[PDB]
Structures are given as structure tokens and as C-alpha cells.
Amino acid sequence: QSCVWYGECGIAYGDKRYNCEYSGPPKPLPKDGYDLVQELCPGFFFGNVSLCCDVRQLQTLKDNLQLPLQFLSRCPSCFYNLLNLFCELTCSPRQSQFLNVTATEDYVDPVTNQTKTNVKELQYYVGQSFANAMYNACRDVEAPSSNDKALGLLCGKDADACNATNWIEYMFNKDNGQAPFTITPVFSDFPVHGMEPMNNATKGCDESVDEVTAPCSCQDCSIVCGPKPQPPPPPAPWTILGLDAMYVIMWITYMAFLLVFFGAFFAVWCYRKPVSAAFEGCLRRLFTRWGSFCVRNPGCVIFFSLVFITACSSGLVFVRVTTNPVDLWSAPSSQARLEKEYFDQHFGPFFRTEQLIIRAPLTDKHIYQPYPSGADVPFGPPLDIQILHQVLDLQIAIENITASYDNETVTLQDICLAPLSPYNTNCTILSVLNYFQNSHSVLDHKKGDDFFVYADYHTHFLYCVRAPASLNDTSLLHDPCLGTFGGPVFPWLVLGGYDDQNYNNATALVITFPVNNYYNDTEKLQRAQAWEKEFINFVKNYKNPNLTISFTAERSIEDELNRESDSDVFTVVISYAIMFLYISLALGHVDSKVSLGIAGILIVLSSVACSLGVFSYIGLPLTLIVIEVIPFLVLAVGVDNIFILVQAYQRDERLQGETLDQQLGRVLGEVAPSMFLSSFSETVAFFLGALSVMPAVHTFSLFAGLAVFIDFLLQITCFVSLLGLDIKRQEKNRSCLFRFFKNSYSPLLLKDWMRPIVIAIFVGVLSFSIAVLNKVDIGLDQSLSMPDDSYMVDYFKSISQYLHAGPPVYFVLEEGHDYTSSKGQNMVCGGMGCNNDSLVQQIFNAAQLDNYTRIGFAPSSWIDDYFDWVKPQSSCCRVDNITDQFCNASVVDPACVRCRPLTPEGKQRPQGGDFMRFLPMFLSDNPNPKCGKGGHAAYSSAVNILLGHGTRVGATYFMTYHTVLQTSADFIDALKKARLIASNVTETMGINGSAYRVFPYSVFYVFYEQYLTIIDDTIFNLGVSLGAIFLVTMVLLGCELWSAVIMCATIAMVLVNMFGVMWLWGISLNAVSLVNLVMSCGISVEFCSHITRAFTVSMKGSRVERAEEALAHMGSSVFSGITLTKFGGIVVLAFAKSQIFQIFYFRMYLAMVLLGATHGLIFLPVLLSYIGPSV
């Protein structure tokens, strides 16, 4: 047991001093630094602590060993062997057995003039089984705050760059900048030159050093645990063998139907070898009297109707308009809305992000060749230094932005959230320029010498993409890359277009400007939106032909909605102009009814305005989208009713001396039941479709329903009187379709042989529609709701094409958990001693899957960080001795003592009241260079404490990130699976009830919460609306069940074919497509009703003739009344500007129209001819 030294010598460089050389006998260490020995490696701490050692050597070891402690504190296993190496290497008592000093030089004392000898160089003899057990047991640890390979950092060279021998040589070599003097190691397993290397006991990541420190986790050790689980496969289409298993269930059934159908034509060829009408009669008489009444009292009626219109539409003064998207697309009391309501109250609302996806088209990738050694590393086009300067200039200019509002000048610093303030207040900008801190000088300053550059921006970039949380470059660059705001900048948030682990290959640059969003405050929101407007205008007009910018803003969507919503104003006006043109010329043929067409158009707009005004009075706000889609619908229905009545009158011949009233009463009594049926069926259809939970469709449905009902009523009354006035007029000088239907079409269509083919064809199309039913999309694209000429479309394309990370997730653990106990922490903390099914571990596994579960990254929990901070080893914590105030980590150390005693007892987790005593100081910790990251910048928001009564903890969250989400399927999949993870954790916590529960909050959950129940919502809505139609028909048409059931079956056929057309044109099944289907099922009656009544009330002999008589009579008015009108309406809307209209309203209505026309005018005729109700 000989010495190699005692004492230390003068300064070598920086603060580094070469130890003084002295190989004599040992010396018990002074009672002064008991504290280091215990702490460094107590394996030396017994009795007489005789050691060739000095307390200033212990404290310079302890002091120099800070980073390795930072990257390896997680496994005491590897940390403790590395420590066992330095302490023994430094002042073990048998230093001469395994050490050989080779170089040494004289030292001068400025105190006594005595020349000593510094140890410049020496050879270190290290056992092989020690380096093997150390590197192999800690070698799998990745570095924290990154997916690196913590050895990738503490080795100076990448995972594949160093082995176990080279890494130790590099660590001991001062050529790196850490070793104060170089130690030359020598591989040895057997004693050579009498210099026996070191081979003390070694411990792996699978074993704990002491009975109170749990072993390291299998995240950081590969023998304890493994990738054991794997998602299952999605086997569907169901029963593939078959070709969809629905292509077959339908095709096979159809073949059976075709055989059972043509086999009765075949067997026929072979054989060749006071309630019944009590309610339908009182209506006729009443309408007969009331039409007469309104015709002989025109003045009173029309005047009262105008007074009513005005009295009802003056309530339009209280009209309020909603433009805020949350209110539009989210139910006020949906589960996701309540979750969001809880999150905004305790943690403040999620902030607003202004992205910027920069791209350099005019540049090519260039190559980086490392000077010392290394394979070439190509950098994408956007990572050029010149392009980086131009983008930095753009960013610094975006920071200028002022745009004073309401006699007040606000700035980005003023609104941008600064996490750790007011200490550092610059603010959060998440751009790749933060690695250089937005400094042209920092970006260009180089650390090399002529003929080669040692370090370069790539050198810094490469280092900090590997470790964005370093406080120094540590590759001799000596430049910190934490960011001006203080806090890491994760490379996946500031880049896009790279390849899975090669930020070198980045093709795009992401630049975020997070801005604080405020809860119950309007001046701040006004100021922020006013700032965002100027930001948008600037970015839109910026001229840098070298760059292609795609931008957005939190307020961009709402603004876009109001800009696309006002550009169709011309469209609704033109639609009515063309409708009036058609009505004016077709309504009968100075045999012109222009006056009546104008009267009808004004009555329709009056009905629209009256609905809007009444509901504004009630307090329902306008969506301005409705104000554009509602007029069309109401116009269609109102014009149809007007034509029915006027034409039945025109074709009615006047009896004997009848003046005017008798004729009008007769016409109204025979035509009103049918028009009344259509109008009432539609009103009920609309109102009933107004029961879905979505405020936009709910309010729209109400508005449209009321407008149809009031328009029908007002029409029948004011318009029959005005018809009387115009009929009296023209009686003082002041058909070709019907001919066709009766002469050549009704007979043709009803031939014996054409009828079976037609029925076969329609049932075949119905089978197809039913077959392709389940293959309809779910959800709305989110990029099609914007006009085509909008920059948000380009931004969405750019996202889908470049971005690699998604929306952040917060797993909010509601208020009520304990947190001050070992088990209470095990249910949560993803750590050493905490459970294996803990919240953090479950979120970690989810992030490990990443395709099944879309949660992409690790939890970034706050409690793990808090414990890491409070550990006595770290020494970050330090309280004042007399004041009990937090002594910063950079302090003169006058009298500050460690918070937790550095003992075996102190080593445990702080479970008791110390927990809550020190938690606030941690949350108050700043990013100290000695200590580390500190928490203030990351967890102050995430942890809530209620003052008083023991300061019990509030709701906390563990925020992670989603995977890049590009379509509705992707969003719905993410919501579902986040809810599932939460469900698992809630189960595992085992609450004695539901006092509290985990739930995830992300920004899009409220908009996508409807697609978790849209299928049962659709089923219920369609079924209920159709049952209402059924009942209304079977009641109003008398009580005949056969006609009612036939009509209901035909409209159901119409809906199924509607679903087929949906699938075929790529329309999606969101709450708008669903409202339109429930509406179409109500608009179909206008076709299906006339024919069936003309057939039912008929007294010919046989079924065929009844059908042909009904066809002629009523279908002459039905083809001219409904089809052409609705066609004029839809063709003007076919040129939309919001995409949402042009896709859903236009396609759904065109489909409905042509489908209803064919069905009514062809398939109803034929089906009744075959199986129609006799009489």
C-alpha cells in the first residue's frame, strides 16, 4: 500500500492543478472532509481513513464530476462503478500496484520559493473485467431529455464512435478539455510489471448498491425487461374470402330476388300453357270556405299578413352573430367540452401558435466533412448558412412587429409567454436559430485555425440536436444551446423533412411564436388578435425570393370563415334572380304571371326574414353560413307550393254562373290537402333533424324549419287572396307537358314489359347502394372547409408534407390525489421504486408503440424531475440555516446547509411533509449552470398548490406530444386511444369510487368528440325522422296504411341511394352530411306524395289504368313544379367559394333532386301499378 501523492500543486490551466507527487505511506484523512469521502465513495470511509489523498482533491473531484452525475445519476449501478474507478484511481491506499507515473515537472511556490514537481504524464493500469462490467452494465442508458444513448454524450463520440477502452482513454485524456491532466490507461487483466491493474467489485444495472436505493429501471437496463408487448393486427374487411363479404351478401341476395321475381313472370308464361274518411272530408270543406273567405275579403287578409310579417321580423334588432369556432362545432356540454372547461380553469388555456414552415427551393444540399474524423454528413437545403442568416433576419423582423391598437402599442414580448419570468423575459420562440440564440455573431463565430476549422455552426448544431439541454457545447466550441428564453428547444419541433433520426437532413424550418391565451379577459385577447392581424399581413407581403413561407395564426381560422362567408353574398342574390326568371316565364303559358311570381318571391324572403327575426328575438345567434344556405332551401319548397296551387287553378274550368270565390274555394279544397301534406312533412322533418348535438346544425335546423312553416302558412293565406285579386284582374284585359305525359309517356312507361325491367333496375341500384354503405368516410377533412384561394390550405398541405411532431397532450390528473406517500407516488412516478404499471410507465409504453397508440414521446413528468432535484447527491437544494429560505445553487455558501441529510435515511424519496416543504422552492428554481435545468421553466404551470391547510396539491399534468396527424381518421384514432390510456390508468389507481380521474386534454378534442357517437346519432336521427314522416303521412292521407307504407318505403330507398351517392362522390359523413340526409328524407315527400294521392283517390277499374291516370294528371305538375325549380336553385350554388358548400350542399342537393325525381316519377308509378292499394 504505497502512495503516489499527498497534497495538490498549483494551477495547470483554467482551475486545473496538477496533483503534487508523493509516493510514501498513507495518512488518515482529516476530520475536515469526511463529507466528501462519504459522498464520493464511502468504500474508503472506515476507522482511520488513511488515504494518499487531500480534501481539496476530494472537492475538486466532486466539483469536476457534475456532468457525468447529470447523465448517469439514473442508474446508481453505472454511476457507482465509474465512481469506484475515479476514487480508487485517485487516492486508494495501494496506488503503486496499479499506477506508474512517467511524466512530471518542477513546480515553484510563490509562497516559500520551494520547487516541487508536477505530474505531467503517467500510465494507468486498469483491469479489463472492470471496464467490461461497467460499460456493459450502464451502456444501454439513453440520455435524458433525448433518445441519444447517454454514452453518446459522456464519451465525446457517438454510440458507434467509441468502445469501452477508447471511451475511458478519451475521458482521461485532457485533449478533450475536461481532464486537468492526461492519464494513459493500459488494458490489463493480469498483473504486469508488478503493476496490477484495478479490478474491484462491479455492479450492473440489474442490482442495487444498497438496501434502500432501488435498482435502475429497464428503460436504462436491458436484462430486467423487454419489448414484450406488440399491438395486434386489424383483420377486416370482414370475411375477405368473398370479396368484401358484403359484395357477396348483397349480390347473392339479389340473384335470389331476380330469380324469385322473373320466376313468376316465368310461371305466368307457363300458366299460359267514422275514421276511414272522417278526417279528410272536414278539411276539404273548411278550406273551401276559407279560400272563399280570403278571396272576398282581400284587403283585411293581406294587410294583416303584412302587419304580421313586420311585427315578427322587427325582432331582428336583437340579432347576435357567433363566429367563434368552439361555439360552432362543439356542444356546450359535451364530455370534451367539460374536460376543456376544467383544464382552462386550473392551468390557463392552451396558448396560440403561429407556425412558419420555411423552405429553400433555390438551394442544393451540401456536404459536411468532419476535420478530425467522421463520415460525411449532408445538410438539407434550408440549413445553409446564408439561408440561415436570411431566416434569422426574418425572425428578428417578426419581432419588431408593433401594430398599435386602440391608442396603445403592444409588442411580441408583451404578449409572447415567457415561462421563467420575471427573471428572464425574452420569450419563447421555437426556432432552430435558438441554438445560436439569434446572433449573427454566434452563428458565424468559428473555433478553428487556418487550413481547417475545428468547430462550425454544424458542429454546434450536431451537438445540440443530440443534446438540446446542454448549458455548454462541451466539444471545445464552448457555446451554450439552451435558448434565449431558457429551456430546451426540441429538434422535432423546429425541423421537418428529415429522416427518422437525421436532423442533418432537415428540409424545412419550423418557427413557433407561442402567445399566452387568457381565460375571462377580452382586452388582452383583442390586443393579441390585433397583433396577429399585422403579423399575418407582414408575413404575407414579405419579399424574400429565396424563401417559401407557409404561415398561420390562432385567429386565422375564424377570420377565414368570415372572409369566405361573405363572398357568396352575390351567389344568393343571383340564385333568386334566376329563380324569378324561371317562375315568371313558366308559371302558365299577356298570359304572363310575372306579378304572381314577384309576389311569391317576396313572400319567400319575408318568411326567411321572419324566421331569422323571431329567433333573434328568442336569442339564438346567426352563423352567417346559415344565412346563406337557408334561403335556398326555403325558396325551393315555397316555389313548389305556389306552382301546385296556381296551376291547378289554371287547369280548372269554371262552372255555371260562379263569380270567383266559388271557383277558388273548389280549387283550394281539392289541392290544399296535398300541398299541406308536403309542407307539414317538411316542417316536421326539419325540426326533428334539429335535435342533434352540434350548435351549428342545431340552430340551422331550427331556423329552416320555422321558415318553411311560416312561409307555408303565410303563403296559403296571403297568396290565395292575392291570387284572387290577380284573377279578378286580367279578366278585364288590363299545356305541352301535360299533353306529353298523358299522350305518349304514361302509356309507354306502363307497358307490360318495360315495367319489370324498370323495377329490376331500381332494385339493383338499391342493392348496390346497400352494399357500399359501410364504406362511407367518417369526419370532415378540415382543409376543405376553407376556400381554394386561402393560405390556410397551403399551410395544411405543407404540414402534411413536412411536419414530424403533432399537438401536445396533457394528461390532467384531476384534483384529489395524495402525492405525499410512497404508494401515492408509485401510482404516478415512473421511477426506481415506483410501480411497474404506473401512470408514467404506461404513457412511456404508449410512446413506445407510436403507431397503434399515436402518443409519440415520453411523458416529461414533473415529479421525476423534482426528485432528481431534491437528491442530496445533486446538492442543488440548499436551505438557509437560520431563515429557512432557499439558497440558490450559485451562492457563496456562507452558511447554507443541504436540505436533505446526506445519509442512508436521507437517500430515500422525500415522502413526508418535507415533500411539500421543499416542492415550492423547487418550482421556484431557475436554470442554474452549476445545478442544471431547474424546474421553474417547465413545471410551475403544471403543478398547482392551494395555500393553507397543509398546502395540498392541485391538478397536475404530464404533457407529451402526438404523432403527426393528417386526416380525420388520424385524429379520431388519437382521441380514442388517449381515452383508452386514461381509462387504464384510472382503473389501476383503484379509487374508492370516482373522486378524481385521469383524462387527456388536447386542442382538437372538442372538435372531434362527435365522431365517437356519430354512427348511433345518425341511426337514431334518420330512424326518428322517418318514423315522424310515416306517421304524418298515414294520418294526413286518411288512415290508409298501404299507401303510407309504400311512400315510407320509397323514401327509405331514396335515403339508401343517398348513402350510395355519398360513398361514390367522396362526401364525408359529418354532422352536416347527416343534417342534409335527414332533410332530404323530408324533401322527398314533395315528389312521393302527389303521385300516391292521385293513385289512391281514383276510381278506374284496374291497377294499370289507375297508375297511368295518376301519372298524367299529377305528374304533369310534379315534373314542372319541383324538378326544374330545385334544379335552378342548385345550379347557381354549384359555383361555391367555401368548398364546404360546393361539396356538401351542392352535391347532396343535386343527388337528392335527381334521385327523388326518378323515384317519384318512375318507381312509384310502377310499384303502385304492381302492388298498389285497390279501390
Ligand SMILES: *[C@@H]1O[C@H](CO)[C@@H](O[C@@H]2O[C@H](CO)[C@@H](O)[C@H](O[C@@H]3O[C@H](CO)[C@@H](O)[C@H](O)[C@@H]3O)[C@H]2NC(C)=O)[C@H](O)[C@H]1NC(C)=O
Ligand atoms: C440522412 O442522414 C444520414 C445521417 O447523416 C445520412 O447518412 C449518411 O449519409 C451520407 C449521404 O451521402 C453519407 O455520405 C454518409 O456516409 C457514407 O459513410 C462512409 C463512411 O461511413 C463514407 O466513406 C461515405 O463517403 C459516405 O459518407 C452516411 N453515414 C451514415 C452513418 O449513414 C443520409 O444520407 C441522410 N439521408 C439522405 C437521403 O441522404
Ligand SMILES: *[C@@H]1O[C@H](CO)[C@@H](O[C@@H]2O[C@H](CO)[C@@H](O[C@@H]3O[C@H](CO)[C@@H](O)[C@H](O)[C@@H]3O)[C@H](O)[C@H]2NC(C)=O)[C@H](O)[C@H]1NC(C)=O
Ligand atoms: C410507425 O408507424 C408506421 C405507420 O406508417 C408503421 O408502418 C411502417 O412504416 C411504413 C408505412 O408507410 C412501412 O415501412 C415500409 O418501408 C419500406 C422500406 O423501403 C418502404 O419501401 C415502404 O414503402 C414502407 O415505407 C410499413 O408499413 C411499416 N414498417 C414496418 C417495418 O412494418 C410502423 O409501425 C412504424 N414506422 C416506422 C417509422 O418504423
Ligand SMILES: *[C@@H]1O[C@H](CO)[C@@H](O[C@@H]2O[C@H](CO)[C@@H](O)[C@H](O)[C@H]2NC(C)=O)[C@H](O)[C@H]1NC(C)=O
Ligand atoms: C476494493 O476491494 C477491497 C477489498 O474488497 C476493498 O477494501 C475493503 O474495502 C471496504 C470498503 O469500505 C472496507 O470496509 C474494508 O475494510 C476493506 N478491506 C480489505 C481487506 O480490502 C476496497 O474498499 C475496494 N475499493 C473500491 C474502490 O471499491
Ligand SMILES: *[C@@H]1O[C@H](CO)[C@@H](O[C@H]2O[C@H](CO)[C@@H](O)[C@H](O)[C@H]2NC(C)=O)[C@H](O)[C@H]1NC(C)=O
Ligand atoms: C435574451 O437574453 C440574452 C442573454 O441570454 C440577453 O442578452 C443577449 O441579447 C442582447 C441583445 O442586445 C445582446 O446584446 C447580448 O450580447 C446577449 N447576451 C450576451 C451573451 O451578451 C437579452 O436580455 C435578451 N435578448 C435581447 C434583449 O435581445
Ligand SMILES: CC(C)CCC[C@@H](C)[C@H]1CC[C@H]2[C@@H]3CC=C4C[C@@H](O)CC[C@]4(C)[C@H]3CC[C@]12C
Ligand atoms: C471528457 C469528459 C467525458 C470528462 C468528464 C468527466 C471529468 C469531470 C473527469 C475526466 C478527467 C477527470 C479529472 C482527471 C484528473 C483529476 C486530478 C485528480 O487529482 C482529481 C480528479 C481530477 C480533477 C479528475 C476530475 C474528473 C475528471 C475531470
Ligand SMILES: CC(C)CCC[C@@H](C)[C@H]1CC[C@H]2[C@@H]3CC=C4C[C@@H](O)CC[C@]4(C)[C@H]3CC[C@]12C
Ligand atoms: C353550414 C351550416 C350548417 C353552418 C355550420 C358550419 C360550421 C359549423 C362548420 C363548417 C366548417 C367547419 C370547420 C371545419 C374545419 C375546421 C378547422 C379545424 O382546425 C377546427 C374545426 C373547424 C373550424 C370546423 C368547425 C366547424 C365548421 C366551422
Ligand SMILES: *[C@@H]1O[C@H](CO)[C@@H](O)[C@H](O)[C@H]1NC(C)=O
Ligand atoms: C454484456 O456481455 C457481453 C459484453 O460484456 C455482451 O455480449 C452482452 O450483450 C452484454 N449484455 C448486454 C448488452 O445486455
Ligand SMILES: *[C@@H]1O[C@H](CO)[C@@H](O)[C@H](O)[C@H]1NC(C)=O
Ligand atoms: C426594427 O428593429 C430594428 C432592429 O432592432 C430597430 O433598429 C428598429 O428601430 C425597429 N423598428 C423599425 C425599423 O421601425
Ligand SMILES: *[C@@H]1O[C@H](CO)[C@@H](O)[C@H](O)[C@H]1NC(C)=O
Ligand atoms: C437571396 O440570396 C441572394 C444571394 O446572393 C442575396 O444576395 C439576397 O440578399 C437574398 N435575398 C433576397 C434576394 O431577397
Ligand SMILES: *[C@@H]1O[C@H](CO)[C@@H](O)[C@H](O)[C@H]1NC(C)=O
Ligand atoms: C408488475 O408487478 C410485479 C413487479 O414487476 C410483478 O409481480 C408483475 O408481474 C409485474 N407485471 C407487469 C406487467 O409489470
Ligand SMILES: *[C@@H]1O[C@H](CO)[C@@H](O)[C@H](O)[C@H]1NC(C)=O
Ligand atoms: C441565485 O440566488 C441569488 C440569491 O439572491 C439571486 O440573487 C440570483 O438572482 C439567483 N439566480 C438565479 C435564480 O438564477
Ligand SMILES: *[C@@H]1O[C@H](CO)[C@@H](O)[C@H](O)[C@H]1NC(C)=O
Ligand atoms: C447552523 O445551525 C446550527 C443549528 O443551531 C448551528 O449549530 C450552526 O452553528 C449553524 N451554522 C451555520 C454556518 O449556519
Ligand SMILES: *[C@@H]1O[C@H](CO)[C@@H](O)[C@H](O)[C@H]1NC(C)=O
Ligand atoms: C390497457 O391495459 C390492458 C391491460 O392492462 C391492456 O390489455 C390494453 O391493451 C391497454 N390498452 C391500451 C394499451 O390501449
